[PDB]
Amino acid sequence: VWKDADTTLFCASDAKAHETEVHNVWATHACVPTDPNPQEIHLENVTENFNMWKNNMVEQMQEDVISLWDQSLQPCVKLSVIKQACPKISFDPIPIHYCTPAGYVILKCNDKNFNGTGPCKNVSSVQCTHGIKPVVSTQLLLNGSLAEEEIIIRSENLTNNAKTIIVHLNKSVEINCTRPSNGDIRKAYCEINGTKWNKVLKQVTEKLKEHFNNKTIIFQPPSGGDLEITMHSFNCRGEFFYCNTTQLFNNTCINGTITLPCKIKQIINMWQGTGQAMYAPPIDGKINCVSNITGILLTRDGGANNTSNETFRPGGGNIKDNWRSELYKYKVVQIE
Numbered sequence: 229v230w231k232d233a234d235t236t237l238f239c240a241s242d243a244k245a246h247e248t249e250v251h252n253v254w255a256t257h258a259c260v261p262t263d264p265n266p267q268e269i270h271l272e273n274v275t276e277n278f279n280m281w282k283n284n285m286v287e288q289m290q291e292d293v294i295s296l297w298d299q300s301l302q303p304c305v306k307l308s309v310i311k312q313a314c315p316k317i318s319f320d321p322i323p324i325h326y327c328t329p330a331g332y333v334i335l336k337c338n339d340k341n342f343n344g345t346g347p348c349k350n351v352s353s354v355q356c357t358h359g360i361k362p363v364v365s366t367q368l369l370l371n372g373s374l375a376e377e378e379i380i381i382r383s384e385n386l387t388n389n390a391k392t393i394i395v396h397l398n399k400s401v402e403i404n405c406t407r408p409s410n411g412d413i414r415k416a417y418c419e420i421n422g423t424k425w426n427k428v429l430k431q432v433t434e435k436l437k438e439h440f441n442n443k444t445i446i447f448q449p450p451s452g453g454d455l456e457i458t459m460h461s462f463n464c465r466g467e468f469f470y471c472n473t474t475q476l477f478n479n480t481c482i483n484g485t486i487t488l489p490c491k492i493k494q495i496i497n498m499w500q501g502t503g504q505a506m507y508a509p510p511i512d513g514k515i516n517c518v519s520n521i522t523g524i525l526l527t528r529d530g531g532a533n534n535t536s537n538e539t540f541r542p543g544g545g546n547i548k549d550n551w552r553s554e555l556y557k558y559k560v561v562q563i564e
C-alpha cells in the first residue's frame with residue numbers, strides 16, 4: 229500500500245563525461261547514470277488519482293533547470309549592476325530522468341488519452357521517469373513527446389479563462405530557424421511548412437470544439453505583455469531567438485512555406501525571474517536549429533460568454549507549464 233507524498237528526487241542521464249556541452253557538464257556532476265535495466269511493474273486492477281497541475285515533481289525540475297542555466301548561461305551584465313564574463317558556449321539540451329530514492333516509487337498513468345487530471349485505469353510503477361529535455365520556450369513546446377492517439381487539451385479549469393491551456397499534439401510539425409552565416413548579424417528566420425501546420429491547426433480547432441460546445445474557434449495574436457510572451461522565444465545553440473508568430477495563427481487558412489521573422493536579442497528578461505541582463509553577441513556562421521513543435525500554449529479570451537465565439541491566443545511565460553506538459557503522467561507516492 230502507498231500514500232501520496234512529496235520527496236527529494238535525484239536525476240539520471242546519459243551525460244558523456246568527456247563532453248564540453250553545458251548540459252553534459254551539468255548532468256555529469258548532478259545526475260547519476262541511467263539504469264541500464266529499468267523495471268516497470270504493471271499494477272493490476274489498480275486505479276489511481278493524478279493531478280498534473282499540482283505535482284511537486286514540476287517544482288523540482290524547475291529548481292534544477294535554474295541551477296543549470298545559472299552556471300551555464302552567464303550574462304556579461306547582471307544584478308548592484310555587475311559586469312562579468314560571458315563566454316560563448318556549447319549548448320544543446322540532453323534528456324534528464326527523475327528518480328525516487330529508497331522508500332518511494334513513481335506511479336505512471338498509461339491511459340492513451342489521459343488528460344492530466346482524474347483517475348487512470350492502467351497504472352504501473354517505475355523508479356525513474358523517461359528522458360525529459362529541459363527546453364525553455366514560450367508559445368510553442370519544442371522537442372517534447374507526442375500524445376499517443378488523439379490531440380489532448382490540458383487545463384486546470386477549462387471554463388476558467390485565466391488558467392493556461394496545454395494543447396498536446398499527436399503529430400509533430402518541424403520549425404527550422406536560421407541566422408544566416410552572412411550584413412545584420414541579428415537577423416534570423418524560421419520556416420514552417422504551411423500545408424503541415426494548417427492541417428494540424430485545424431485539428432486543434434475541431435478538438436477545441438468538443439470542449440467548447442461546438443462554438444466558433446478563433447485565433448488571434450497576443451494582445452500584449454512581455455515580448456517573451458507575445459513572441460515565440462527560445463534558445464538555439466546558446467543564442468536567444470525571438471520569433472514573430474503572427475502568420476502561425478492566421479485564421480484564413482483553417483499552402484506554402486511560412487517564414488517567420490526572428491530577432492536574436494542580447495537584453496533579455498530572465499525567465500528565472502532574476503531580472504534583465506545582457507548576454508554576449510552571437511557566434512559567427514550559420515546558427516541553425518531544427519525543432520519539432522510538439523505542443524501549444526494557449527490562453528482563452530475572457531468576456532465572450534455572450535457571443536458564440538471563443539478566442540485563443542498563444543501564451544505562456546510560466547516555464548513550469550513546460551515541465552508539466554512532460555510530467556503530467558507521473559506522481560510520487562510513499563510506501564508503508
Ligand SMILES: NC[C@H](NC(=O)c1ccc(-c2cc(F)c(Cl)c(F)c2)[nH]1)c1nc(CO)c(CO)s1
Pocket residue numbers: 364365366454456457461462463468496497498499500501502503545546
Ligand atoms: N518583464 C517581466 C519579466 N519577465 C520574464 O522574466 C520572463 C518571462 C518569460 C521569459 C522567457 C522565456 C523564454 F522562453 C526565453 Cl528563451 C527567455 F529568454 C525568457 N522571461 C518578469 N519579472 C518578474 C519578477 O517580479 C515577473 C513575475 O514573476 S515577470
Ligand SMILES: NC[C@H](NC(=O)c1ccc(-c2cc(F)c(Cl)c(F)c2)[nH]1)c1nc(CO)c(CO)s1
Pocket residue numbers: 305306307309495497498501502503504505506
Ligand atoms: N529590480 C528589478 C530588476 N532589475 C534589473 O534587472 C536590472 C537593473 C539594472 C540592470 C542592467 C543594467 C545594464 F547596464 C545592463 Cl547592460 C544590463 F544588462 C542590465 N538590470 C528587473 N527585472 C526585470 C524583468 O525580469 C526588469 C525589466 O527589464 S528590471
Ligand SMILES: *[C@@H]1O[C@H](CO)[C@@H](O)[C@H](O)[C@H]1NC(C)=O
Pocket residue numbers: 338339350
Ligand atoms: C497498459 O499500459 C501498457 C504500457 O504502455 C500497455 O502496453 C498496455 O497495452 C496497456 N493496457 C491497457 C489495458 O491499458
Ligand SMILES: *[C@@H]1O[C@H](CO)[C@@H](O)[C@H](O)[C@H]1NC(C)=O
Pocket residue numbers: 343344345346347381382383384386
Ligand atoms: C480531465 O478528465 C477529468 C476526469 O473526467 C475531468 O474531470 C476534467 O474536467 C478533464 N479536464 C479536461 C481539461 O478535459
Ligand SMILES: *[C@@H]1O[C@H](CO)[C@@H](O)[C@H](O)[C@H]1NC(C)=O
Pocket residue numbers: 377378379380398399431435
Ligand atoms: C490526431 O488526433 C485527431 C483527433 O484530435 C485525429 O483526428 C487525427 O487523426 C490524429 N492524427 C494522428 C496522426 O494520430
Ligand SMILES: *[C@@H]1O[C@H](CO)[C@@H](O)[C@H](O)[C@H]1NC(C)=O
Pocket residue numbers: 385387388389
Ligand atoms: C472553474 O472556473 C469557473 C469559472 O471561472 C468557476 O465557476 C469554477 O468554480 C472553477 N472551478 C474550480 C474547481 O475552481
Ligand SMILES: *[C@@H]1O[C@H](CO)[C@@H](O)[C@H](O)[C@H]1NC(C)=O
Pocket residue numbers: 404405406419518
Ligand atoms: C532547414 O532550413 C535550412 C535553410 O535555412 C536548410 O538549409 C536546411 O536543409 C533545413 N533543414 C531541414 C532538416 O529541413
Ligand SMILES: *[C@@H]1O[C@H](CO)[C@@H](O)[C@H](O)[C@H]1NC(C)=O
Pocket residue numbers: 421422423424427485
Ligand atoms: C508540406 O507537407 C505536406 C504534407 O502535409 C507535403 O505533402 C509537402 O510536400 C510538404 N512541403 C514542404 C515544402 O515541406
Ligand SMILES: *[C@@H]1O[C@H](CO)[C@@H](O)[C@H](O)[C@H]1NC(C)=O
Pocket residue numbers: 472473474
Ligand atoms: C509581427 O508581425 C506582424 C506582421 O508583419 C506585425 O504587424 C507586428 O508588428 C509584428 N510584431 C512585432 C512585435 O514586431
Ligand SMILES: *[C@@H]1O[C@H](CO)[C@@H](O)[C@H](O)[C@H]1NC(C)=O
Pocket residue numbers: 320321363370371462463464465517518519520
Ligand atoms: C530540438 O532538437 C533538435 C534535434 O536534436 C536540436 O538539434 C535542436 O537544437 C533542439 N531545439 C531546441 C530549441 O533545443
